Design an enzyme around this catalytic site. Structure first.
Site, PDB file in Angstrom:
ATOM      1  N   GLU D  71       0.771  -1.354  -0.045  1.00  0.00           N
ATOM      2  CA  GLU D  71      -0.166  -0.034   0.184  1.00  0.00           C
ATOM      3  C   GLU D  71       0.965   1.064   0.210  1.00  0.00           C
ATOM      4  O   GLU D  71       1.771   0.557   0.292  1.00  0.00           O
ATOM      5  CB  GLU D  71      -1.021   0.159   1.340  1.00  0.00           C
ATOM      6  CG  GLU D  71      -1.329   1.034   2.013  1.00  0.00           C
ATOM      7  CD  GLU D  71      -1.234   1.645   3.044  1.00  0.00           C
ATOM      8  OE1 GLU D  71      -0.508   1.115   4.244  1.00  0.00           O
ATOM      9  OE2 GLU D  71      -2.002   2.651   3.827  1.00  0.00           O
ATOM     10  N   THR D 145       1.615  -7.795   5.010  1.00  0.00           N
ATOM     11  CA  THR D 145       2.948  -7.829   4.260  1.00  0.00           C
ATOM     12  C   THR D 145       4.112  -7.625   5.057  1.00  0.00           C
ATOM     13  O   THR D 145       5.225  -8.498   4.590  1.00  0.00           O
ATOM     14  CB  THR D 145       2.945  -6.468   3.546  1.00  0.00           C
ATOM     15  OG1 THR D 145       1.530  -5.861   2.672  1.00  0.00           O
ATOM     16  CG2 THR D 145       4.320  -5.775   2.407  1.00  0.00           C
ATOM     17  N   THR D 179      -3.385  -4.915  15.177  1.00  0.00           N
ATOM     18  CA  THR D 179      -4.105  -4.083  14.547  1.00  0.00           C
ATOM     19  C   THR D 179      -5.057  -5.331  13.856  1.00  0.00           C
ATOM     20  O   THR D 179      -6.424  -4.666  13.264  1.00  0.00           O
ATOM     21  CB  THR D 179      -3.433  -3.753  13.005  1.00  0.00           C
ATOM     22  OG1 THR D 179      -2.440  -4.161  12.385  1.00  0.00           O
ATOM     23  CG2 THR D 179      -2.584  -2.887  13.879  1.00  0.00           C
ATOM     24  N   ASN D 228       8.647   3.698  18.596  1.00  0.00           N
ATOM     25  CA  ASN D 228       9.646   3.825  16.789  1.00  0.00           C
ATOM     26  C   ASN D 228      10.787   4.299  17.862  1.00  0.00           C
ATOM     27  O   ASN D 228      11.944   4.056  17.293  1.00  0.00           O
ATOM     28  CB  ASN D 228       8.930   4.257  15.599  1.00  0.00           C
ATOM     29  CG  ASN D 228       7.550   3.218  15.304  1.00  0.00           C
ATOM     30  OD1 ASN D 228       7.454   2.434  16.086  1.00  0.00           O
ATOM     31  ND2 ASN D 228       7.334   4.341  13.980  1.00  0.00           N
ATOM     32  N   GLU D 254      29.871 -11.749  12.636  1.00  0.00           N
ATOM     33  CA  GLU D 254      30.154 -11.053  14.231  1.00  0.00           C
ATOM     34  C   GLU D 254      29.255 -11.703  14.870  1.00  0.00           C
ATOM     35  O   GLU D 254      29.046 -12.066  16.206  1.00  0.00           O
ATOM     36  CB  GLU D 254      31.111 -10.143  14.811  1.00  0.00           C
ATOM     37  CG  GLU D 254      32.124 -10.074  14.937  1.00  0.00           C
ATOM     38  CD  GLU D 254      32.963  -9.384  15.433  1.00  0.00           C
ATOM     39  OE1 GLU D 254      32.938  -8.215  14.577  1.00  0.00           O
ATOM     40  OE2 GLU D 254      33.030  -9.545  16.787  1.00  0.00           O
TER      41      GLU D 254
HETATM   42  N1  GTP Z   1       6.564  -0.765  17.108  1.00  0.00           N
HETATM   43  C1  GTP Z   1       5.722  -0.680  16.236  1.00  0.00           C
HETATM   44  N2  GTP Z   1       4.751  -1.625  15.864  1.00  0.00           N
HETATM   45  C2  GTP Z   1       3.927  -1.125  14.696  1.00  0.00           C
HETATM   46  C3  GTP Z   1       4.357   0.184  14.136  1.00  0.00           C
HETATM   47  N3  GTP Z   1       2.949  -0.357  12.761  1.00  0.00           N
HETATM   48  C4  GTP Z   1       2.568  -1.333  12.592  1.00  0.00           C
HETATM   49  N4  GTP Z   1       2.907  -1.616  13.614  1.00  0.00           N
HETATM   50  C5  GTP Z   1       2.453  -3.479  14.196  1.00  0.00           C
HETATM   51  O1  GTP Z   1       1.885  -4.107  13.123  1.00  0.00           O
HETATM   52  C6  GTP Z   1       1.115  -5.117  13.328  1.00  0.00           C
HETATM   53  C7  GTP Z   1       0.140  -5.156  11.765  1.00  0.00           C
HETATM   54  O2  GTP Z   1       1.559  -5.163  10.819  1.00  0.00           O
HETATM   55  P1  GTP Z   1       1.180  -3.540   9.598  1.00  0.00           P
HETATM   56  O3  GTP Z   1       2.755  -3.541   9.637  1.00  0.00           O
HETATM   57  O4  GTP Z   1       0.855  -2.204  10.308  1.00  0.00           O
HETATM   58  O5  GTP Z   1       0.600  -4.312   8.409  1.00  0.00           O
HETATM   59  P2  GTP Z   1       1.154  -4.780   7.238  1.00  0.00           P
HETATM   60  O6  GTP Z   1       3.467  -4.531   7.309  1.00  0.00           O
HETATM   61  O7  GTP Z   1       1.807  -3.473   6.437  1.00  0.00           O
HETATM   62  O8  GTP Z   1       0.866  -5.191   5.991  1.00  0.00           O
HETATM   63  P3  GTP Z   1      -0.528  -5.154   5.883  1.00  0.00           P
HETATM   64  O9  GTP Z   1      -2.041  -6.224   6.876  1.00  0.00           O
HETATM   65  O10 GTP Z   1      -0.831  -5.078   4.065  1.00  0.00           O
HETATM   66  O11 GTP Z   1      -1.269  -3.694   6.075  1.00  0.00           O
HETATM   67  C8  GTP Z   1       0.749  -5.067  14.894  1.00  0.00           C
HETATM   68  O12 GTP Z   1       0.756  -6.370  15.424  1.00  0.00           O
HETATM   69  C9  GTP Z   1       1.292  -3.459  15.248  1.00  0.00           C
HETATM   70  O13 GTP Z   1       1.194  -3.040  16.017  1.00  0.00           O
HETATM   71  C10 GTP Z   1       5.132   0.718  13.994  1.00  0.00           C
HETATM   72  O14 GTP Z   1       5.188   2.097  13.986  1.00  0.00           O
HETATM   73  N5  GTP Z   1       5.476   0.526  15.315  1.00  0.00           N
HETATM   74  C1  RME Z   2     -12.565  -8.015  15.713  1.00  0.00           C
HETATM   75  C2  RME Z   2     -11.232  -7.142  15.630  1.00  0.00           C
HETATM   76  C3  RME Z   2     -10.291  -7.861  16.839  1.00  0.00           C
HETATM   77  C4  RME Z   2      -9.267  -7.490  16.286  1.00  0.00           C
HETATM   78  N1  RME Z   2      -8.440  -6.572  15.383  1.00  0.00           N
HETATM   79  C5  RME Z   2      -9.367  -6.316  14.384  1.00  0.00           C
HETATM   80  N2  RME Z   2      -8.643  -5.499  13.040  1.00  0.00           N
HETATM   81  C6  RME Z   2      -9.427  -4.830  12.987  1.00  0.00           C
HETATM   82  C7  RME Z   2      -8.471  -4.405  11.239  1.00  0.00           C
HETATM   83  C8  RME Z   2      -9.125  -3.563  10.420  1.00  0.00           C
HETATM   84  C9  RME Z   2     -10.753  -3.624  10.153  1.00  0.00           C
HETATM   85  N3  RME Z   2     -11.263  -2.871   9.330  1.00  0.00           N
HETATM   86  O1  RME Z   2     -11.983  -2.992   9.219  1.00  0.00           O
HETATM   87  O2  RME Z   2      -9.956  -2.677   8.109  1.00  0.00           O
HETATM   88  C10 RME Z   2     -11.179  -3.920  11.646  1.00  0.00           C
HETATM   89  N4  RME Z   2     -12.667  -4.212  11.295  1.00  0.00           N
HETATM   90  C11 RME Z   2     -13.579  -3.878  12.313  1.00  0.00           C
HETATM   91  C12 RME Z   2     -14.785  -3.357  12.191  1.00  0.00           C
HETATM   92  N5  RME Z   2     -15.190  -2.149  11.389  1.00  0.00           N
HETATM   93  C13 RME Z   2     -17.034  -2.617  10.661  1.00  0.00           C
HETATM   94  C14 RME Z   2     -16.338  -0.979   9.607  1.00  0.00           C
HETATM   95  O3  RME Z   2     -15.880  -0.267  11.190  1.00  0.00           O
HETATM   96  C15 RME Z   2     -15.219   0.172  11.843  1.00  0.00           C
HETATM   97  C16 RME Z   2     -14.880  -0.884  12.527  1.00  0.00           C
HETATM   98  N6  RME Z   2     -11.147  -4.585  12.206  1.00  0.00           N
HETATM   99  C17 RME Z   2     -11.012  -6.676  14.294  1.00  0.00           C
HETATM  100 MG    MG Z   3      -0.257  -1.940   6.131  1.00  0.00          MG
END
Ligand code: GTP
Ligand code: RME
Ligand code: MG
Ligand code: ACP
Ligand code: GDP
Ligand code: CA
Ligand code: CA
Ligand code: MG
Ligand code: MG
Lengths: 54, 314, 428, 437
Positions: D71, D145, D179, D228, D254
């Site tokens: 993305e 990703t 997330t 971060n 190393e």
């Molecule tokens: N420490 C830290 N953790 C992060 C950060 N961004 C995302 N995470 C962690 O990464 C996990 C989710 O993976 P992401 O890196 O956000 O997802 P992605 O690699 O972009 O892959 P996609 O699902 O396609 O978006 C979650 O457990 C978040 O807590 C960050 O900026 N700092």
């Molecule tokens: C249950 C649950 C537990 C832990 N993690 C998530 N993660 C998540 C990540 C992305 C989306 N997403 O919708 O992109 C999402 N949706 C949840 C329902 N949404 C409906 C429309 O309003 C916003 C809420 N949930 C969800």
């Molecule tokens: Mg992402």
């Protein structure tokens, strides 16, 4: 405890402290996995279109 | 509304603790695998300590101290005492003991010949207290059980009430194969003694009686002649392993109830025999002790809406 | 994953659809003419998800209005925001569907479906990254249920790799137009089980019970019911069209909310529950929002959450409030209902917060539950279906359109299968 | 001099990379426009910092880094951020739609179409390297990703760079800052597929970083930027030896030699101290002994676990600031008798120490206060297996019901890969238990 391998320079120094002594697949196989997965998608989608045709 | 889970159905002590917590109306029991618990009454083996203290917004407490097994295993206890400078090989309250892999009277876990014990091990060796204090009337052996509770702050609480586990059959130096007069364990006295229950009910003498007997028989008291040593022994063992099991800065907190078993020789010297990590309680004392656990080990961490212990300061 | 294509079909579909567009149009600062007059650029950061742009800096909803009779769609044009809709996107017939699933799905609707698909295709061809489609419709009528599901099936054929999302209104004897609604709904539910990824179950029985019991409305109208549907549609789409901690999209939504393909029917909830035009002076505290949205009386689907278990749960808060207090209240409602969450899906509750409050409320909360208690809704429909079907009552309206009895028996079996599928995960 | 190439994948890897390269520029005096006045050799150089920065004729120092995300939203902020000029556009690679938190979507479906482009851009940086060492890969376990595409890239890098080392900086999932609900799945799938391809992996548990920000920084609701900037400090300490003149951990090889006696057990535990809030204008500066003792407190670790109930296979102390060996040895002697540190019998009980005189750099206007001395300890302890057990158990709970599995099978992935990945994790847990129990 013995201090050994003491190295020094302008940015700092490093050493070691001892408190006691002791007592891949090929690019071919990767494609065979990635294309095998893409075919399973194609099959599942063909089944969907077929089901929608009925 | 605090939550807790039960993972040892065989624990009579915490079955009573579970009963009290429910009766308070402020504690709720969940299924044994629900991770969203405030208190865990864990199992005796392979308790998953590595999964505690990782639930957001939940303060978690468990009724076992990770690493306390070093003190509650007969082989580990001997190695701990020999290899710890605080306890030392010159320790004067632990009988001489040795680890073996498969007056000169010894016991293995009772024989006077070394080859007899070594063949049985192949089929811990500890010096047998040949001169034990003998109750009267009866000329009988006993041992002392002390219950100790260690809370999350590592306060050492000694239950004021102890129990004496006596041998109905009079002691005999001659034959070590008798066993019923050489081993004080409650279960054995029930199934090996015609004399079982003659003097004290269930071969369980409590402190008020033992104190009185000591006063009439020996012109001394339980506190001075025995309890000082017991309190010192308890303090020494738990302080030795405190840096290894303390949860002061952990993401989860621990408390544990221990059962210390002592022996007293003819000269009123107290000896440590073993320590139990999952002890059972005396029938009469369950009510008081279990409420004591809730008072100082549970409600101190999870408050609600005279003391029966002796705080062993250290 | 940017633009979404909206579709509303039939009377109910277009009435709730029209209300949805005038509500979010206000939230984004778009007036009935399609020009922006807002004050925050957060209203436009993700405006392209639901709106297209045109010369003169005008925003046109990416919406398609479908119906087999002109009545309701004539109402939309003369409505408040009727002029915002692209005129070419009005696709309507003349004969109507007569509250007949067969007419909408097999005869009258078949005649009109291709012209609707031409409009859909034109909207998708302009999309830089099409997420999928959201459809508003009822299940008890003929056009929304019969033709709406025909469109869903044909849209999936042409766009098999896009998400299908629906707001589907369940019929109820408490607010019924015809006696054959259980027929039309049972036939439709089967379609939704196969060809949607997410469906918001909006139960007219729950909407009525809320207006009567809670809102103290002796005789609620469809406008009062659509007031609740309007608030819920804004809530469950907030995270799709506004920038925030959770930039949701249709696919991520389904991945995280749907653990099993067929169990994709959500219970929506809203708090505070309010009556149209009745201004609320006292704003709710965070604890009140949390307790209400989990309360059975706030559910838009007449099911008891305590009778089942939550597979996944999402809660969206709107307004200026303490996240710390939001986090604390969420953990405490989870503890009260700790018995009603499945233990084999860790961390199955998602919390999101949007700073922009909806019109008239300084803070609110939208509940989205994937609960096995939703089976009570499908079981209620099944009993009403079987009561008539065991005597073949009113079946001639459908056989006269070419349908056979066997197709009804199959719909009956499919829904009972769905109910039993919810039941196995409720005892897991 | 041997170059190192950094690869940042997914949102977590990209945003963490932003913090690291921001800190690198402050430490080395490199300005946002790439200008580094202290560099008197213009357009070239064999210095230590050239391991992470190449030079242009105009005297611009550009990171040897590649940012990849399916993305475009996250990397776009790097394209318009304060360090836009730092990187050239070819280093920032983005797609159109992400993996939707689906490992299979990032590994098989959407990753298959961008893997060749990424390898081509990486090959462009490798061709400017006289003696490439290897790669540093930043990614999350939980993202689609971060987990799916990383494992695919790791597989290809082994093929195209069989002789080069690969180190990881992995974000271990935590529900406090999660997330997606399927993060346990993605974590196991990527650990199984990447295990044989990573020489050394530094895991950071978001839960540990989250709590360290709350307790020690007095931040009630830490943000990704808060997490971060703390993470970049740890990464900076770990990579400091590659970027400055020294003798400990001078090349990526190393790290494996000093920290990884068993290749599969290649997850060193990182502990950092001190973490002081910039709000306090008065904190007393901790001594060498006080910061060294802190390295054995669980509250300061990047992964919450109990080192008291594990065996050590290697220990590295990385100091920065006012530190002399005399004090270090004194502290070690004290700590060894006050705490029970048990090494494996086939390993010498010892510590490799590295001192960098330059005090830790902090971002201006951040939440971390400037300190005169800090230390990062890298200890390969069997205690970190606790984290594997936690993650594997969550995996088991969901997989027993096959919950969410259809999303993966729908992308062409087979169900047998779930069990295959879990079995490898089971073998990994036995390796830990056999080494330290
Ligand atoms: N420490 C830290 N953790 C992060 C950060 N961004 C995302 N995470 C962690 O990464 C996990 C989710 O993976 P992401 O890196 O956000 O997802 P992605 O690699 O972009 O892959 P996609 O699902 O396609 O978006 C979650 O457990 C978040 O807590 C960050 O900026 N700092
Ligand atoms: C249950 C649950 C537990 C832990 N993690 C998530 N993660 C998540 C990540 C992305 C989306 N997403 O919708 O992109 C999402 N949706 C949840 C329902 N949404 C409906 C429309 O309003 C916003 C809420 N949930 C969800
Ligand atoms: Mg992402
Ligand atoms: N060295 C010794 N000298 C004298 N008596 C001893 C002894 N070692 C053991 N005993 C006797 O054996 C009895 C039990 O031995 P042991 O230490 O194994 O307790 P136990 O583990 O069998 C059951 P419990 O957990 O209830 O104590 C003691 O109460 C004591 O009477
Ligand atoms: N909530 C709500 N339900 C409606 C509305 N209009 C119709 N319904 C319901 O929808 C069903 C009738 O379907 P309808 O949309 O009128 O027929 P259609 O034109 O063929 O799609 C009945 O169960 C009604 O209760 C509305 O505006 N709001
Ligand atoms: Ca016709
Ligand atoms: Ca130079
Ligand atoms: Mg015993
Ligand atoms: Mg109608």
């Amino acid at each position: 405890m013995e201090v050994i391998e003491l190295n020094k320079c302008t940015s700092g120094q490093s050493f070691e402290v001892i408190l006691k002594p002791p007592s891949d697949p090929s690019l071919e196989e990767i494609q065979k996995k990635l294309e095998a997965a893409e075919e399973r998608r194609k099959y599942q989608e063909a089944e969907l279109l077929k089901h929608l045709a009925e | 509304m605090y939550t807790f889970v039960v993972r040892d159905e065989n624990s009579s002590v915490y079955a009573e603790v579970s009963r009290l917590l429910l009766a308070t109306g402020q504690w709720k029991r969940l299924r044994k695998d629900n991770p969203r618990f405030n208190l865990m009454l864990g199992e005796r083996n392979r308790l998953p300590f590595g999964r505690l203290g990782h639930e957001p917004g939940l303060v978690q407490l468990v009724n076992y101290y990770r690493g306390a097994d070093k003190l509650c295993r007969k082989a580990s206890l001997v190695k701990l005492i020999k290899t710890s400078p605080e306890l030392s090989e010159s320790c004067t309250w632990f009988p001489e003991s040795y680890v073996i892999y498969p007056g000169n009277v010894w016991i293995a876990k009772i024989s006077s010949e070394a080859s007899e014990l070594l063949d049985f091990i192949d089929e811990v060796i500890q010096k047998y207290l040949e001169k034990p204090l003998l109750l009267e009337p009866g000329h009988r052996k006993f041992d002392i059980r002390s219950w100790v509770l260690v809370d999350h702050l590592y306060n050492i609480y000694l239950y004021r009430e102890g129990v004496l586990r006596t041998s109905s059959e009079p002691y005999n130096s001659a034959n070590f194969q008798d066993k019923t007069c050489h081993l004080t364990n409650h279960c054995i006295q029930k199934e090996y003694s015609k004399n079982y229950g003659r003097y004290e009910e269930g071969n369980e003498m409590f402190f008020e009686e033992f104190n009185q007997y000591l006063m009439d028989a020996l012109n001394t008291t339980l506190e001075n002649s025995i309890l000082l040593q017991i309190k010192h022994i308890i303090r020494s063992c738990l302080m030795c392993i405190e840096p290894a099991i303390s949860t002061k800065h952990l993401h989860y907190q621990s408390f544990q109830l221990f059962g210390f078993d002592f022996m007293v020789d003819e000269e009123l010297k107290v000896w440590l025999i073993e320590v139990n990590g999952a002890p059972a309680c005396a029938q009469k004392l369950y009510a008081e002790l279990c409420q004591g656990i809730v008072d100082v080990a549970i409600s101190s961490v999870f408050p609600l809406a005279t003391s029966i212990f002796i705080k062993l300061h250290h | 994953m940017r633009e979404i294509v909206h579709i509303q079909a039939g009377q109910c579909g277009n009435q709730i659809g029209a209300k949805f567009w005038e509500v979010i149009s206000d939230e984004h600062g778009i007036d009935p003419t399609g020009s922006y007059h807002g004050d925050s650029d957060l209203q436009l950061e993700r405006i392209n998800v639901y709106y297209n742009e045109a010369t003169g800096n005008k925003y046109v909803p990416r919406a398609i209005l479908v119906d087999l009779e002109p009545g309701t769609m004539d109402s939309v044009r003369s409505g408040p925001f009727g002029q915002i809709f692209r005129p070419d996107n009005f696709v309507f017939g003349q004969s109507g569907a007569g509250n007949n699933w067969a007419k909408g799905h097999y005869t009258e609707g078949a005649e009109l479906v291709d012209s609707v698909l031409d409009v859909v295709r034109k909207e998708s061809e302009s999309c830089d990254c099409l997420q999928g489609f959201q459809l508003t419709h009822s299940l008890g009528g003929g056009t929304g249920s019969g033709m709406g599901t025909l469109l869903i099936s044909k849209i999936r054929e042409e766009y098999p790799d896009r998400i299908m999302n629906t707001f589907s209104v369940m019929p109820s004897p408490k607010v019924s137009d015809t006696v054959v609604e259980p027929y039309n709904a049972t036939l439709s539910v089967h379609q939704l089980v196969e060809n949607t990824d997410e469906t918001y179950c909006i139960d007219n029985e729950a909407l009525y019970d809320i207006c009567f019991r809670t809102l103290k409305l002796t005789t609620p109208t469809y406008g009062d019911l659509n007031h609740l549907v309007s608030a819920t549609m804004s809530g469950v789409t907030t995270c799709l069209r506004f920038p925030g901690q959770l930039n949701a999209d249709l696919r991520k939504l389904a991945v995280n909310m749907v653990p099993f393909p067929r169990l994709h029917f959500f219970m929506p909830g809203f708090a505070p529950l309010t009556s149209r035009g009745s201004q609320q002076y006292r704003a709710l505290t965070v604890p009140e929002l949390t307790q209400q949205m989990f309360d059975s009386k706030n559910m838009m689907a007449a099911c008891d959450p305590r009778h089942g278990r939550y597979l996944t749960v999402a809660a969206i808060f709107r307004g200026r409030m303490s996240m710390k207090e939001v986090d604390e209240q969420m953990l405490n409602v989870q503890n009260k209902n700790s018995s009603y969450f499945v233990e084999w899906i860790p961390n199955n509750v998602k919390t999101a917060v949007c700073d922009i409050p909806p019109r008239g409320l300084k803070m609110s909360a939208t509940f989205i539950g994937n609960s096995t208690a939703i089976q009570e809704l499908f079981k209620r429909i099944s009993e009403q279906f079987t009561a008539m079907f065991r005597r073949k009552a009113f079946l001639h309206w459908y056989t006269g359109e070419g349908m056979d009895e066997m197709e009804f028996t199959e719909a009956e079996s499919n829904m009972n299968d769905l109910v039993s599928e919810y039941q196995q995960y409720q005892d897991a | 001099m041997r170059e190192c190439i950094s690869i940042h994948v997914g949102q977590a890897g990209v945003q963490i990379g932003n913090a690291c390269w921001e800190l690198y520029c402050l430490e080395h005096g490199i300005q946002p426009d790439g200008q580094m006045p202290s560099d008197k050799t213009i357009g070239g150089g064999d210095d230590s910092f050239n391991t992470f920065f190449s030079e242009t004729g105009a005297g611009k120092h550009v990171p040897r880094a590649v940012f990849v995300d399916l993305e475009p939203t996250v990397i776009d902020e790097v394209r318009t951020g304060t360090y836009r000029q730092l990187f050239h556009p070819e280093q920032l690679i983005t797609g159109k739609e992400d993996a939707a938190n689906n490992y299979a979507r990032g590994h098989y479906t959407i990753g298959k179409e961008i893997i060749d482009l990424v390898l081509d851009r990486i090959r462009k940086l490798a061709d400017q390297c006289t003696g490439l060492q290897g790669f540093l890969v930043f990614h999350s376990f939980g993202g689609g990703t971060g987990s799916g595409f990383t494992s695919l890239l790791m597989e290809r890098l082994s093929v195209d760079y069989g002789k080069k080392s690969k180190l990881e900086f992995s974000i271990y999932p935590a529900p406090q800052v999660s997330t997606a609900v399927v993060e346990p799945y993605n974590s196991i799938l990527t650990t199984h597929t990447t295990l044989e391809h990573s020489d050394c992996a530094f895991m950071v548990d978001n839960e540990a970083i989250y709590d360290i920000c709350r307790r020690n920084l007095d931040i009630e609701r830490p943000t990704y930027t808060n997490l971060n900037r703390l993470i970049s400090q740890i990464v900076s300490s770990i990579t400091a030896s590659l970027r400055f003149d020294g003798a400990l951990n001078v090349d990526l090889t190393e790290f494996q030699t000093n920290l990884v006696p068993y290749p599969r057990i290649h997850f060193p535990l990182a502990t950092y101290a001190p973490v002081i809030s910039a709000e306090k204008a008065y904190h007393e500066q901790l001594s060498v002994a006080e910061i060294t003792n802190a390295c054995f407190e669980p509250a300061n670790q990047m992964v919450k676990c109990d080192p008291r109930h594990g065996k050590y296979m290697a220990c590295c102390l990385l100091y920065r600031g006012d530190v002399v060996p005399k004090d270090v040895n004194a502290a070690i002697a004290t700590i060894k008798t006050k705490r029970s540190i048990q090494f494996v019998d086939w390993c010498p009980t010892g510590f490799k120490v590295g001192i960098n005189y330059q005090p830790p750099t902090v971002v201006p206007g951040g939440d971390l206060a400037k300190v005169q001395r800090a230390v990062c300890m890298l200890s390969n302890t069997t205690a970190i297996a606790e984290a594997w057990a936690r993650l594997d158990h969550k995996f088991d709970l969901m997989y027993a019901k096959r919950a969410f599995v259809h999303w993966y099978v729908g992308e062409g992935m087979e169900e047998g890969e779930f069990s295959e990945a879990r079995e490898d994790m089971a073998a990994l847990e036995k390796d830990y238990e056999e080494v330290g129990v």
